[PDB]
Amino acid sequence: MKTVTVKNLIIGEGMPKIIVSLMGRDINSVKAEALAYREATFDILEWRVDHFMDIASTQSVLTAARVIRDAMPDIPLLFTFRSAKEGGEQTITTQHYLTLNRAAIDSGLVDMIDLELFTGDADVKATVDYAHAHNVYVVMSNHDFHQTPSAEEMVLRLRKMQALGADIPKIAVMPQSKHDVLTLLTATLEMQQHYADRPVITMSMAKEGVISRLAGEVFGSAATFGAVKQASAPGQIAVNDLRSVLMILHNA
Amino acid sequence: MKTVTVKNLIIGEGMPKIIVSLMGRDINSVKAEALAYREATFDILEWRVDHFMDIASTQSVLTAARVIRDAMPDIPLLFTFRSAKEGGEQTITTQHYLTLNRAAIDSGLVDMIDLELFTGDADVKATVDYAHAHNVYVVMSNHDFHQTPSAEEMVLRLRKMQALGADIPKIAVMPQSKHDVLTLLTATLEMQQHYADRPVITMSMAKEGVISRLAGEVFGSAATFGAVKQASAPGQIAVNDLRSVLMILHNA
Ligand SMILES: *C[C@@]1(O)C[C@@H](C(=O)O)C[C@@H](O)[C@@H]1O
Ligand SMILES: *C[C@@]1(O)C[C@@H](C(=O)O)C[C@@H](O)[C@@H]1O
Numbered sequence: 456m457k458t459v460t461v462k463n464l465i466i467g468e469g470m471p472k473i474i475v476s477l478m479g480r481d482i483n484s485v486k487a488e489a490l491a492y493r494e495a496t497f498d499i500l501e502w503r504v505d506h507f508m509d510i511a512s513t514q515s516v517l518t519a520a521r522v523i524r525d526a527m528p529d530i531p532l533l534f535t536f537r538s539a540k541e542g543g544e545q546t547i548t549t550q551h552y553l554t555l556n557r558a559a560i561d562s563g564l565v566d567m568i569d570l571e572l573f574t575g576d577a578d579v580k581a582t583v584d585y586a587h588a589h590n591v592y593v594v595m596s597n598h599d600f601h602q603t604p605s606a607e608e609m610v611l612r613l614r615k616m617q618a619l620g621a622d623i624p625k626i627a628v629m630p631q632s633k634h635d636v637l638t639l640l641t642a643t644l645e646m647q648q649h650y651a652d653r654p655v656i657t658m659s660m661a662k663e664g665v666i667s668r669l670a671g672e673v674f675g676s677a678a679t680f681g682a683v684k685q686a687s688a689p690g691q692i693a694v695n696d697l698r699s700v701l702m703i704l705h706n707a
Numbered sequence: 708m709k710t711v712t713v714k715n716l717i718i719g720e721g722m723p724k725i726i727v728s729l730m731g732r733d734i735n736s737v738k739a740e741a742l743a744y745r746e747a748t749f750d751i752l753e754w755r756v757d758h759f760m761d762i763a764s765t766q767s768v769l770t771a772a773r774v775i776r777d778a779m780p781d782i783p784l785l786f787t788f789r790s791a792k793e794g795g796e797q798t799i800t801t802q803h804y805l806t807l808n809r810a811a812i813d814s815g816l817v818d819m820i821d822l823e824l825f826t827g828d829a830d831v832k833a834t835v836d837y838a839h840a841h842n843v844y845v846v847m848s849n850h851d852f853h854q855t856p857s858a859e860e861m862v863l864r865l866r867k868m869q870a871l872g873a874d875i876p877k878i879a880v881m882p883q884s885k886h887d888v889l890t891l892l893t894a895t896l897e898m899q900q901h902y903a904d905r906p907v908i909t910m911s912m913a914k915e916g917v918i919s920r921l922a923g924e925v926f927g928s929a930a931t932f933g934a935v936k937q938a939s940a941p942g943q944i945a946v947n948d949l950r951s952v953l954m955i956l957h958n959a
Contacts, residue, residue, distance in 0.1 A: 633896055633926060637889060644885055665959045666925050670918045673885060696955045700921075703948045707917045 461531035467654030470705040471671035472498040472678040476687035478506040489526035504536040505543040520564040534559045535569035541598040567592040583620040595621030603628040603635035609642035625656040647675025661689045713783040719906030723923035724750035724930040728939035730758040737771045741778035756788040757795035772816045786811040787821035793850040819844045835872040847873030851880045855887035861894035877908040899927030913941045
């Protein structure tokens, strides 16, 4: 394991790190959420750009990123446009996705970016290189909102992300059975124990999958998402309750 | 599913039931522990009879059971002599083990007894029948303190307990790896999905297995052990922390 350290937070050792997502339409809503989040306890702030209205303007997007950065100057900040292709709130062209991510990277405003593996090989490789050249980490991600692939398929995907230079491979899948939750845990453990040389994040979604959000220290997921007031994906629980469980498991 | 209702507690529905073990070496210590346990919060009290150092006397054993019952008149009370063969504190003859269990049964002081599956089929059947004749439920049990059998063999054993008339089959196994914990969860789920005729209790022991003590609601373990002050098996955590996690998982 080589860890990923952002603003004194060490991802990939100790207790899994808590990520929460900020979701807002516009500058005023982003400010209101950032302010409300001061009362919560978490490790990493993800800005879910796909919840923002004016994603067409690179200037509008960067202004919002700047507001968030300045609101929370000492928090690791992760920039994520979750495409509708992968379960997000709106569509984007591959070219405009590239433009927004490059602009986020070279602005200095973010510590980490999410890059969807399935975007396309040339765009992924170029964006990984661009991120690294500007001292930004890449969470390379994949999501299946309908079903859970085989463990073999999931492990190969996480390995592919590593081979493409992801700092943190990430996969989220939807269980259709309790068995599918075990498949996700099995894949996570296999990856972490046998192939990974860096942190990985995994989750099985929905209430059925929630154990996967709690047991990362055991099965090898380095971070986990909680909800401040609204979940950013199915299965997230109240962030304080998430923290309570993580602490109990860490100290067991 | 044939649930087991004891003093208004429905075992096999809702949150896994919290069991704690009372371990006292003599009558005075049993009394002191029973009194102290009243303020802890749990669902079922197990008396670990093999920790009692006056098991030579049937009178002494029954007097200790009566002290516990008098301290906790409304708590489901489980009488367990854990044999040295299966990880307990002392060795007694098979006839001594059976006599203590029969005396516990016919005293009316306890609601449930633990009977080890591999005591011998004829003796197990006879003692189950005697329990049922006196309105006592049987937790039939098996323990592997060395390692984790195959999922398939664990399921076979739980099904054998069902065939012998157990009210609640129970198996505890020792992980040698994180993978082994998943094996135990897999066996548990296979009972829930395919062999769900009565409640089952399962656990993977030690620190690596702790998640199995927390995730019973997900995969189908009907009860889970916590520690009041000292653990009665490896991997048990503080009972209030156990309860906190069970509640979070139940309400997720
Ligand atoms: C990584 C990610 O897709 C995981 C979601 C989850 O399942 O918790 C939350 C999203 O906000 C996040 O981008
Ligand atoms: C059933 C049993 O053997 C399970 C142990 C455990 O692993 O928590 C605790 C024992 O006291 C109990 O009899």
